[PDB]
Design a protein around this motif. Structure first.
Motif, PDB file in Angstrom:
ATOM      1  N   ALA A 125       0.846  -1.194   0.000  1.00  0.00           N
ATOM      2  CA  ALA A 125       0.000   0.000   0.000  1.00  0.00           C
ATOM      3  C   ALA A 125       0.883   1.246   0.000  1.00  0.00           C
ATOM      4  CB  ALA A 125      -0.897   0.002   1.218  1.00  0.00           C
ATOM      5  N   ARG A 126       1.914   1.235   0.839  1.00  0.00           N
ATOM      6  CA  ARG A 126       2.828   2.379   0.937  1.00  0.00           C
ATOM      7  C   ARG A 126       3.504   2.708  -0.393  1.00  0.00           C
ATOM      8  NH1 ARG A 126       7.978   3.415   1.047  1.00  0.00           N
ATOM      9  NH2 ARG A 126       8.759   1.262   1.216  1.00  0.00           N
ATOM     10  N   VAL A 127       4.079   1.689  -1.019  1.00  0.00           N
ATOM     11  CA  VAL A 127       4.781   1.849  -2.281  1.00  0.00           C
ATOM     12  C   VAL A 127       3.855   2.314  -3.392  1.00  0.00           C
ATOM     13  CG1 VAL A 127       6.039   0.642  -4.103  1.00  0.00           C
ATOM     14  CG2 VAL A 127       6.566   0.180  -1.706  1.00  0.00           C
ATOM     15  N   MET A 128       2.683   1.697  -3.495  1.00  0.00           N
ATOM     16  CA  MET A 128       1.740   2.083  -4.536  1.00  0.00           C
ATOM     17  C   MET A 128       1.220   3.496  -4.347  1.00  0.00           C
ATOM     18  SD  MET A 128      -0.607  -1.370  -5.255  1.00  0.00           S
ATOM     19  CE  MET A 128      -1.269  -0.535  -6.875  1.00  0.00           C
ATOM     20  N   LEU A 129       0.899   3.866  -3.107  1.00  0.00           N
ATOM     21  CA  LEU A 129       0.396   5.219  -2.857  1.00  0.00           C
ATOM     22  C   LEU A 129       1.437   6.277  -3.220  1.00  0.00           C
ATOM     23  CD1 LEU A 129      -1.573   4.589   0.429  1.00  0.00           C
ATOM     24  CD2 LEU A 129      -2.568   5.425  -1.729  1.00  0.00           C
ATOM     25  N   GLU A 130       2.711   5.985  -2.976  1.00  0.00           N
ATOM     26  CA  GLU A 130       3.758   6.942  -3.340  1.00  0.00           C
ATOM     27  C   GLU A 130       3.742   7.198  -4.849  1.00  0.00           C
ATOM     28  OE1 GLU A 130       7.455   5.162  -2.010  1.00  0.00           O
ATOM     29  OE2 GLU A 130       7.252   6.129  -0.053  1.00  0.00           O
ATOM     30  N   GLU A 131       3.576   6.135  -5.634  1.00  0.00           N
ATOM     31  CA  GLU A 131       3.574   6.258  -7.094  1.00  0.00           C
ATOM     32  C   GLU A 131       2.287   6.901  -7.590  1.00  0.00           C
ATOM     33  OE1 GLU A 131       6.147   5.890  -8.996  1.00  0.00           O
ATOM     34  OE2 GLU A 131       7.209   5.394  -7.140  1.00  0.00           O
ATOM     35  N   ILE A 132       1.168   6.492  -7.005  1.00  0.00           N
ATOM     36  CA  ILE A 132      -0.131   7.038  -7.378  1.00  0.00           C
ATOM     37  C   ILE A 132      -0.202   8.535  -7.118  1.00  0.00           C
ATOM     38  CG2 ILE A 132      -2.579   7.035  -6.801  1.00  0.00           C
ATOM     39  CD1 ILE A 132      -2.209   3.987  -6.219  1.00  0.00           C
ATOM     40  N   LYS A 133       0.359   8.979  -6.006  1.00  0.00           N
ATOM     41  CA  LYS A 133       0.305  10.400  -5.706  1.00  0.00           C
ATOM     42  C   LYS A 133       1.059  11.272  -6.722  1.00  0.00           C
ATOM     43  CE  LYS A 133      -0.634   9.844  -0.790  1.00  0.00           C
ATOM     44  NZ  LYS A 133      -0.064   9.909   0.582  1.00  0.00           N
TER      45      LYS A 133
END
Length: 158
Positions: A125-133
């Protein structure tokens, strides 16, 4: 980007596209990919076949058959290479890259690498949210948790 978090069956997402946690062979087998193939129909696998193998970390776009959405963005998270936070980051970025190029406004993403990939929900979740943001605000990404506890974990990472 704008972000929504829901718990449910990603195949019922009503929007422009859904992201499939794929292997680089683009073979819809284990996981939800199997459900995607099931509900979407064989046309999805046919298009995947026409495309051929890609590299782990990359993404490929195909139609979504009978799914409410228009496209299925196949994010290759494993296969010739093992799933890792690194392959997840790359696959996420690639999936987003495809979404922007198609001018999509709503795309659903599962927690890539946490199914067949076996990676931890919190770290993914952490890694994906960083990219999504990093994506444009014109794009709204809906993150799907397959269990309520997973959806709650994603929300805590927002």
């Amino acid at each position: 980007a704008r972000i929504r978090v829901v718990q449910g069956d990603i195949t019922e997402f009503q929007g422009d596209a859904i992201v499939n946690a794929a292997n680089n062979y683009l073979k819809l087998g284990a996981g939800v990919a199997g459900a995607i193939l099931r509900k979407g129909g064989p046309s999805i696998q046919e298009e995947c076949d026409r495309i051929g193998k890609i590299r782990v970390g990359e993404a490929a776009v195909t139609g979504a058959g009978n799914l409410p959405v228009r496209y299925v963005i196949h994010a290759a998270v494993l296969g010739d290479e093992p799933a890792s936070l690194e392959t997840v980051r790359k696959a996420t970025k690639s999936a987003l890259e495809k979404a922007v190029e198609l001018g999509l406004k709503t795309v659903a993403f599962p927690l890539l690498g946490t199914g067949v990939g076996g990676l931890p929900v919190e770290a993914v979740a952490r890694v994906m949210l960083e990219e999504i943001k990093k994506a444009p605000d014109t794009l709204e990404v809906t993150l799907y948790g397959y269990r309520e506890e997973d959806a709650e974990a994603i929300r805590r990472a927002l």
